[PDB]
Scaffold this active site. Structure first.
Site, mmCIF file in Angstrom:
data_model
loop_
_atom_site.group_PDB
_atom_site.id
_atom_site.type_symbol
_atom_site.label_atom_id
_atom_site.label_comp_id
_atom_site.label_asym_id
_atom_site.label_seq_id
_atom_site.Cartn_x
_atom_site.Cartn_y
_atom_site.Cartn_z
ATOM 1 N N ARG B 255 0.824 -1.204 0.000
ATOM 2 C CA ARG B 255 0.000 0.000 0.000
ATOM 3 C C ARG B 255 0.860 1.257 0.000
ATOM 4 N NH1 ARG B 255 -4.836 1.152 4.319
ATOM 5 N NH2 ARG B 255 -6.190 2.348 2.912
ATOM 6 N N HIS B 356 -4.012 17.427 12.565
ATOM 7 C CA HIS B 356 -5.019 16.735 11.763
ATOM 8 C C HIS B 356 -6.323 16.561 12.538
ATOM 9 C CE1 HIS B 356 -6.446 13.784 8.738
ATOM 10 N NE2 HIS B 356 -6.918 13.129 9.783
ATOM 11 N N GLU B 357 -6.224 16.146 13.802
ATOM 12 C CA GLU B 357 -7.425 15.894 14.592
ATOM 13 C C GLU B 357 -8.174 17.187 14.895
ATOM 14 O OE1 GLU B 357 -8.550 12.868 14.895
ATOM 15 O OE2 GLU B 357 -6.736 12.344 13.778
ATOM 16 N N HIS B 360 -10.005 18.195 11.867
ATOM 17 C CA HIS B 360 -11.271 17.465 11.863
ATOM 18 C C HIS B 360 -12.284 18.130 12.787
ATOM 19 C CE1 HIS B 360 -10.429 14.358 9.121
ATOM 20 N NE2 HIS B 360 -9.742 13.548 9.905
ATOM 21 N N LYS B 463 -1.989 -6.306 -11.690
ATOM 22 C CA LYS B 463 -1.086 -5.609 -10.779
ATOM 23 C C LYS B 463 0.275 -5.369 -11.419
ATOM 24 C CE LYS B 463 -1.064 -6.282 -6.066
ATOM 25 N NZ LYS B 463 -1.066 -4.886 -5.552
ATOM 26 N N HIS B 487 -9.828 -3.007 4.474
ATOM 27 C CA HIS B 487 -11.082 -2.566 3.865
ATOM 28 C C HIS B 487 -11.622 -3.586 2.867
ATOM 29 C CE1 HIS B 487 -8.393 0.859 4.844
ATOM 30 N NE2 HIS B 487 -9.470 1.323 5.452
#
Ligand SMILES: *[C@@H]1O[C@H](CO)[C@@H](O[C@@H]2O[C@H](CO)[C@@H](O)[C@H](O)[C@H]2NC(C)=O)[C@H](O)[C@H]1NC(C)=O
Lengths: 247, 596
Positions: B255, B356-357, B360, B463, B487
């Site tokens: 990833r 970041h929080e 948010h 891929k 996910h």
């Protein structure tokens, strides 16, 4: 009491100190519409009406002349010609409850906007569609009154705010309430001017031995010229002599 | 009266009573994540069904309305959320089978067991350990074995489970008047209202790759540089014509390439920008970091946060039995309750995470005025992108020197600029092809384009062209390798991550232009520029009340999603890589494999 059952109080035949209410930090919002708050102690009306209740934090703006909203139309109404003041202050520390002070209720549904100085406490079910609500709530049936879930932690917007709206009426009946008088002290043997109990004039004030009967206030000798006055505080007989003049 | 007034009265009755229940449930969740105790657990149950016992019942009162004639867009859109069939349209047996298969798939994925053959008595999970071993190691055998073992104990037996999960979710898709689950997933980026802004769900499919072809050359140069560095480190493991396998990317999914940054560092001579030692020297605790970040937020243009947050919200070190899981989260509990949850420490990474929080939190402030059913952004990617904007912006040396984090006599040069840009690209643009191919594979497997057998081989061969990964060990039909991903076992839409990076880059570029800043894009800072904050908050206040296409009109001038800011950011990196790996030819071969 709740906003839809706002407490109505009538005040008459007394003296009101508006300065201490103005000089109070416990009130978050204090907006007057008749006169300036300082001048309020000077003039007066014949009676005062107080409308006291508790609302949400965001609904204080609704309580104003020429204002619309849920509270401003369904629970209480203020006319454009309103004279008086509005005093609001946060009460989250007291009115809000940890378990939820659900006693406070506000009207949400009503067929007509409430008239100024009018109270509605009707709990009849409201209908918004076409089918009538025959008792039990159905599709188009929502209760006009909704409770307040007041908690200590609800954000400034939702905190319970106590609001008292003071209106002043000056009908043809004689005035009953007025402000303070703030009388000064007394001097003697000096040419000064005075306004003893609303009776104004110049001269010099000396001691006199006249014996007023227990009910007169001031005495004049002849040709309608005041000579003696009784001080409203000490209740003693004085003497007035015109200040000296000549050629 | 008309039915529209009845619907409006129903919504006005619904939202008031929904606010209290939502606040109670969110408060319970926040308390449990702040107080890990048994009692807060059953409360969720005591709330959960209760919330359903409200919401579905309100949903029960949201079908008789013919939701096709309400002229008011806001009211109709709000009622549309309540007019969702959901899984109730399915039969009870089908719904319970779906719940059972989701539960068992999630448990199997989260309970990975890999025991080395020499010591079969000790397996490892996704918990730190094997995750750390494969995240940071220099070898070809252990990483390959770990990848094979995880794909064997999570993908070998998940083929029928994944097949049934996909087919039953797709059956629910038709049961919800959708010929494919991809339409339901892409409905977040959908609007059929104001003219000039309507977007079709199928258009997003082509937009995903229409914004991907431009980064293909830059991705190819980055791949060539990484391959050259691997040849420098790994001897004769990757052919120049070929490409690196999956297990050499630093993870079994490949990833992110941040794990491989150490091998492919551009210039290790110059240290990275880090003032954590200075943070300790300056004695910046959690409170000081929070206050400085909030001051930066105010200087940007975002309003100061309301009172009461500094007490209820946990900040650092739960400590004793009064424990608290502190995964970085921003809580919008409702009724004007906004809190933070994090183990904030003296760290630059923790500094960016706190930024970041609280970004948010600021976005939660933005759409607080919206009704309960509209207490969300235009799309799910906007929240994360906005949260990442100021965190990315604060990393520039200008902001650090403004509050004296970096040295007052700090001077930057091109070497550290290239190093930082490549390090950021190894995570930002190094994950876009993988997300693209994963989302396309999910779309086609949900659409049923590929037959039952042609699932795994097609994935592995594609891929090679998309990501550039060869197969060190074969997986044709007895493995379900993407099923070993976070996910995949929780029915998670993966387009949000792809759109988030593009959205945040577009916003950063637009603010850089309308912020009076000059020079490279990576050094752009928005501190002490109230105009940029006001421009951001103008779009932030929109929330769900406006379409995402209309939302992409205040900060940026283009409603559509574009790739130009992504390439604008990595311009120095592209120039450096143009002349860096000149000897190494760009491109890879999909025929070469480690086995043959
Ligand atoms: C107004 O109030 C003052 C203060 O109470 C009264 O003054 C008092 O008068 C009595 C009568 O001799 C004295 O014994 C007290 O010592 C006084 N108190 C003081 C000066 O502080 C005054 O009488 C009142 N006026 C009235 C009743 O008409």
């Amino acid at each position: 009491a709740s906003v839809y059952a706002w407490n109505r109080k009538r005040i008459s035949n007394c003296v009101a100190d508006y300065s201490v209410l103005y000089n109070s930090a416990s009130f978050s919002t204090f907006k007057c519409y008749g006169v300036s708050p300082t001048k309020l102690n000077d003039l007066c009306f014949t009676n005062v009406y107080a409308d006291s209740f508790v609302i949400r934090g965001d609904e204080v703006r609704q309580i104003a002349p020429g204002q619309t909203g849920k509270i401003a139309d369904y629970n209480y109404k203020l006319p454009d010609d309103f004279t008086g003041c509005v005093i609001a202050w946060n009460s989250n520390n007291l009115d809000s409850k940890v378990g939820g002070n659900y006693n406070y209720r506000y009207r949400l549904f009503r067929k007509s906007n409430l008239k100024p100085f009018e109270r509605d406490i009707s709990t009849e079910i409201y209908q918004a569609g076409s089918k009538p609500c025959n008792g039990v709530e159905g599709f188009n049936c929502y209760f006009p009154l909704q409770s307040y879930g007041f908690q200590p932690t609800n954000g400034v917007g939702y905190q319970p705010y106590r609001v008292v709206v003071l209106s002043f009426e000056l009908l043809h009946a004689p005035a009953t309430v007025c402000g303070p008088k703030k009388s000064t002290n007394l001097v003697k043997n000096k040419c000064v001017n005075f306004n003893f109990n609303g009776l104004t004039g110049t001269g010099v004030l000396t001691e006199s031995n006249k014996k007023f009967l227990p009910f007169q206030q001031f005495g004049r000798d002849i040709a309608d010229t005041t000579d003696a006055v009784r001080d409203p505080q000490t209740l003693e007989i004085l003497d007035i002599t015109p200040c000296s003049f000549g050629g | 009266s008309t039915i529209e007034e009845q619907a409006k009265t129903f919504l006005d009755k619904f939202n008031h009573e929904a606010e209290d229940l939502f606040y109670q449930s969110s408060l319970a969740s926040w308390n449990y994540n702040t107080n890990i105790t048994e009692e807060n657990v059953q409360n969720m149950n005591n709330a959960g069904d209760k919330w359903s016992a409200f919401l579905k019942e309100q949903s029960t009162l949201a079908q008789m309305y013919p939701l096709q004639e309400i002229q008011n867009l806001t009211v109709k859109l709000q009622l549309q959320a309540l007019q969702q069939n959901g899984s109730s349209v399915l039969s009870e047996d089908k719904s319970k089978r779906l719940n059972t298969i989701l539960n068992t798939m999630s448990t199997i994925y989260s309970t990975g067991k890999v025991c080395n053959p020499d010591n079969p008595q000790e397996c490892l999970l996704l918990e730190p350990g094997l995750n750390e071993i494969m995240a940071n190691s220099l070898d070809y055998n252990e990483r390959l074995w770990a990848w094979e073992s995880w794909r064997s104990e999570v993908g070998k037996q998940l083929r029928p489970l994944y097949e049934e999960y996909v087919v039953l979710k797709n059956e629910m898709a038709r049961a919800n008047h959708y010929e494919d689950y991809g339409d339901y997933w892409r409905g977040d980026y959908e609007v059929n209202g104001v003219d000039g802004y309507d977007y079709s769900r199928g258009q997003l499919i082509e937009d995903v790759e229409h914004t991907f072809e431009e980064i293909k050359p830059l991705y190819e140069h980055l791949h060539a540089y990484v391959r050259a560095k691997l040849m420098n480190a790994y001897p004769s493991y990757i052919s120049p014509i070929g490409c690196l396998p999956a297990h050499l990317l630093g993870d079994m999914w490949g990833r992110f390439w941040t794990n491989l940054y150490s091998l492919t560092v551009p210039f290790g001579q110059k240290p990275n920008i880090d003032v954590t030692d200075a943070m300790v020297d300056q004695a910046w605790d959690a409170q000081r970091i929070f206050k400085e970040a909030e001051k930066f937020f105010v200087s940007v243009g975002l309003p100061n946060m309301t009172q009461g947050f500094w007490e209820n919200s946990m900040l650092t070190d739960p400590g004793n039995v009064q424990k608290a899981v502190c995964h970085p989260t921003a809580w919008d509990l409702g009724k004007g309750d906004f809190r933070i949850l994090m183990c904030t420490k003296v760290t630059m990474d923790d500094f960016l995470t706190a930024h970041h929080e609280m970004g948010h939190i600021q976005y939660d402030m933005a759409y607080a005025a919206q009704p309960f059913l509209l207490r969300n952004g235009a799309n799910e990617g906007f929240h994360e992108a906005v949260g990442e904007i100021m965190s990315l912006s604060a990393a520039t040396p200008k902001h650090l020197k403004s509050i004296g984090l970096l040295s007052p006599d700090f001077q930057e040069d091109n070497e550290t600029e290239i190093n930082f840009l490549l390090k950021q690209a190894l995570t930002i643009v190094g994950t876009l092809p993988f997300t693209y191919m994963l989302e396309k594979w999910r779309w086609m497997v949900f659409k049923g384009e590929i037959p039952k057998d042609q699932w795994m081989k097609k994935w592995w061969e594609m891929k090679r062209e998309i990501v550039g990964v060869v197969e060190p060990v074969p997986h044709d039909e007895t493995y379900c390798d993407p099923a070993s991903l976070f996910h995949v076992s929780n029915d998670y839409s993966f387009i949000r991550y792809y759109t988030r990076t593009l959205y945040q880059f577009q916003f950063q570029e637009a603010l850089c232009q309308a912020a009076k800043h000059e020079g490279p894009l990576h050094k752009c800072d928005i501190s002490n520029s109230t105009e940029a904050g006001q421009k951001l908050f103008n779009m932030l206040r929109l929330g769900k009340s406006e379409p995402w296409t209309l939302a992409l009109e205040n900060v940026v001038g283009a409603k559509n999603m574009n790739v130009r800011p992504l390439l604008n950011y990595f311009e120095p990196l592209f120039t450096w890589l143009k002349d860096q790996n000149k000897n190494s030819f760009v491109g890879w071969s999909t025929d070469w494999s480690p086995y043959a």
